[PDB]
């Protein structure tokens, strides 16, 4: 009829490769088969240029398509069914035990040809003539034993191959691979012809079976490296899907199929390096899809799948990087990494909506749809969101794009906020806030500042909390004055260590958590000036440091401190007595204080605001 091409992801993520089989071989031989398999794993030892694509696997109206009709047929074709069958055996040249070799290899090839009769596959046999090498044209018993084979089965002579000694076995394995390339491409072409002949007939114009056929056609082509032909048959299948009706119960499956198709064709793009072509196909179909659905769209569908769309395309971005293309990433390291990240954000928001529509009183299996939601309720951790953010983070960091990755970092911390996970949010914010002050732009600086307020109060890193709060009061004039007053009260509280006021948010658990704090914690702008330095060991300096408050609200005028320095030798507007210098120290030392540390109101500004000298 019109059955799905496949509902199976995680398929052929690596470059698809042929498979030729090896039978169930016992441990008794596996040791020497080790060497045997070594040559086989030699395909994985050698460079891709030397490496043959094929690998190994083990086993013990109109008429309906055979080999195409179902997606498990596709997959079983992919790896379960080898294009060619090869059974490796040993052949010691002897007299009558070698006749027993004849009978035994006859039995095994009889079983093998029965299996082939099940599944229409070409066969080859490999024999180690473990004896010493001899010239070709010497062993008539080779012909005799081939004839014993043929009367048993009829396998052609040339399909027989020999790997006498390991030092010989290696080269004979290389040419084995070459011959296998031969037969494998032969079988692949034969199946290609099968598909095209199938496609020339319609079972009463079902029109979707042929879609499966052209899909499998692309499979064949990419097996045979004709990437262009197969990718364009894929795209033609996309066109065919377009011709199909939309918005039915199928349209979601249509969208997923087109996702498969976009995946494959974009692979074949970047293999052929047609970048903007891949971009155009990507967009074209994805906005097709956004149009095609207006609802249901429970938005773990067509939104999460949108996320997976950008996920696969990011996969193909990194695939290009492994290939080495710098184009789109000089443009945008991952155009779609963070994009899929915001798509999983909308995923989670839609999940919140799902909970909302659930909070309604919540017969065509809508409960299963609700059960869908329950399934969708599972993928609500949104930690995978955080990880996708991490990949986008690193991906943009690849070309050292600090700003963008930093703002994705504040994204991460915001998400941890949404999840209620204050800790690591606070960590990333702790990194960002000095950065944001370095960007000098106070607006978002303050916005992440109140975010940090929430983060630290929830965490209880009240040292960090108050540091951000105080550099916030520095220039908090963009915010409410009364909240400045409240926060200043919080400042005196924390300096005393007594619980801070924003109990309007606080709940007792984290409250106690930070009550634990500050037992360990150990430690608006004004100006420093000098009337005289570099003295003649007679001068007397004095308070040239103008203590200015740029906060509208005052801080309680408590007290003062000055800290002595040792270079060379050891020795609105509010001003009050300090007599900072009356100690007649030694000459030519400019004691410029690291930080002010006078006791106005409380200890200090601590967060790194102190000037040098005159």
């Amino acid at each position: 009829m019109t059955m799905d091409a496949t509902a199976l992801p995680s398929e052929l993520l690596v470059t698809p490769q042929p498979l030729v089989g090896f039978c169930g071989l016992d441990t008794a031989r596996v040791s020497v088969h080790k060497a045997v398999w070594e040559a086989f794993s030699g395909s994985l030892q050698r460079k891709a240029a030397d490496r043959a694509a094929v690998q190994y696997k083990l086993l013990p109206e109109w008429y309906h398509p055979k080999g195409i009709l179902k997606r498990n047929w596709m997959l079983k074709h992919l790896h379960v069914l080898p294009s060619v069958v090869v059974l490796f055996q040993d052949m010691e040249w002897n007299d009558l035990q070698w006749t027993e070799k004849q009978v035994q290899c006859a039995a095994i090839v009889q079983a093998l040809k029965n299996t082939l009769q099940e599944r229409n596959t070409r066969l080859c046999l490999v024999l180690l003539q473990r004896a010493a090498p001899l010239p070709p044209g010497e062993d008539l018993l080779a012909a005799e034993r081939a004839a014993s084979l043929t009367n048993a089965c009829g396998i052609t002579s040339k399909m027989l191959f020999i790997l006498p000694h390991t030092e010989h076995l290696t080269g004979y394995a290389l040419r084995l691979e070459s011959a296998f390339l031969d037969m494998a491409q032969s079988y692949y072409a034969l199946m290609s012809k099968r598909i095209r002949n199938h496609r020339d007939q319609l079972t009463a114009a079902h029109t979707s079976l042929k879609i499966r056929h052209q899909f499998k056609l692309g499979f064949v082509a990419e097996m045979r490296q004709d990437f262009s032909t197969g990718q364009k048959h894929y795209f033609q299948a996309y066109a065919n899907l377009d011709e199909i009706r939309i918005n039915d119960g199928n349209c979601l499956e249509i969208k997923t199929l087109a996702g498969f198709l976009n995946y494959k064709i974009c692979r074949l793009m970047f293999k052929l390096k047609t970048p903007r072509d891949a971009i155009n196909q990507f967009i074209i179909h994805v906005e097709k899809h956004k149009s095609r659905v207006g609802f249901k769209d429970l938005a773990f569908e067509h939104h999460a799948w949108l996320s997976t769309q950008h996920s696969v395309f990011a996969e193909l971005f990194c695939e290009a990087i492994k290939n080495g293309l710098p184009a789109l990433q000089t443009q945008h390291p991952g155009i779609y990494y963070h994009k899929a990240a915001e798509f999983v954000m909308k995923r989670r928001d839609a999940a919140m909506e799902a909970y909302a529509a659930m909070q309604a009183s919540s017969v065509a299996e809508q409960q299963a749809n609700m059960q869908l939601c329950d399934q969708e309720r599972s993928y609500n951790h949104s930690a995978a969101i955080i990880a996708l953010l991490s990949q986008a983070m690193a991906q943009f960091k690849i070309y050292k794009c600090l700003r963008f990755r930093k703002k994705l970092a504040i994204d991460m911390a915001e998400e941890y906020l949404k999840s209620g996970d204050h800790a690591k949010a606070l960590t990333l914010y702790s990194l960002m806030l000095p950065d944001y002050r370095q960007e000098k732009w106070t607006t978002i600086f303050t916005d992440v500042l109140l975010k940090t307020l929430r983060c630290a109060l929830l965490s209880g890193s009240v040292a960090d909390y108050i540091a951000c709060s105080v550099e916030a009061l520095s220039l908090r004039h963009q915010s409410d004055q009364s909240e400045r007053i409240l926060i200043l009260e919080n400042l005196w509280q924390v300096f005393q260590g007594v619980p801070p006021m924003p109990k309007t948010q606080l709940t007792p658990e984290a409250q106690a958590l930070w009550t634990s704090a500050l037992a360990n914690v150990k430690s608006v702008e004004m100006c420093a000036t000098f009337e005289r330095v570099q003295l003649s060991n007679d001068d007397l300096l004095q308070l040239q440091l103008i203590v200015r408050v740029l906060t509208d609200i005052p801080l309680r005028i408590r007290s003062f401190h000055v800290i002595l320095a040792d270079a060379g030798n050891p020795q609105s507007y509010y001003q009050l007595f300090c007599s900072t210098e009356a100690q007649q120290f030694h000459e030519n030392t400019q004691l410029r204080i690291v930080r002010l540390e006078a006791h106005m109101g409380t200890d200090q500004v601590a967060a790194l605001l102190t000037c040098s000298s005159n």
Partner: protein
């Protein structure tokens, strides 16, 4: 349709106005738009955007249905607007003209000496000229 008219100094946003063909942007997109503009400007500057010729950069960024143009003066000043669409009837020669006029108003405000460089574009007369440019484009 909405345009955000933004002049950019070294690191801040001196003057950003979030307007539409009907009025200012009622949508609560202010902070998100400002952050996106700043990140795009920083990345492009790190790449090469700092250059001598008055630099045209159309579709140098692409947000959700808002496509960005950056412009560079040899005096190190940047300029941004967006179009509220993946597709809407407009041109790019109009962008050239409007940001040329934006430069003209920029330097005519730079004429105002009370305006020290690197500050918010405070004057409601200048800003109403800017929103008249807005009306010129939306």
């Amino acid at each position: 349709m909405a345009f955000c008219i933004a002049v950019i100094g070294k690191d801040n946003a001196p003057l950003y106005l979030t307007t539409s063909d009907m009025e200012q942007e009622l949508e609560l997109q202010y902070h998100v738009n400002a952050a996106l503009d700043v990140v795009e400007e920083k990345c492009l500057i790190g790449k090469g955007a700092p250059e001598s010729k008055e630099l045209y950069l159309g579709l140098l960024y692409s947000t959700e249905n808002h496509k960005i143009y950056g412009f560079v003066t040899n005096t190190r000043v940047k300029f941004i607007v967006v179009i509220d669409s993946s597709n809407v009837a407009l041109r790019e020669n109009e962008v050239r003209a409007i940001f040329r006029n934006l430069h003209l108003l920029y330097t005519d405000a730079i004429c105002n000496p009370f305006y020290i460089p690197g500050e918010s574009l405070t004057s409601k007369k200048f800003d109403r000229a800017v929103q008249k440019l807005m009306s010129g484009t939306a």
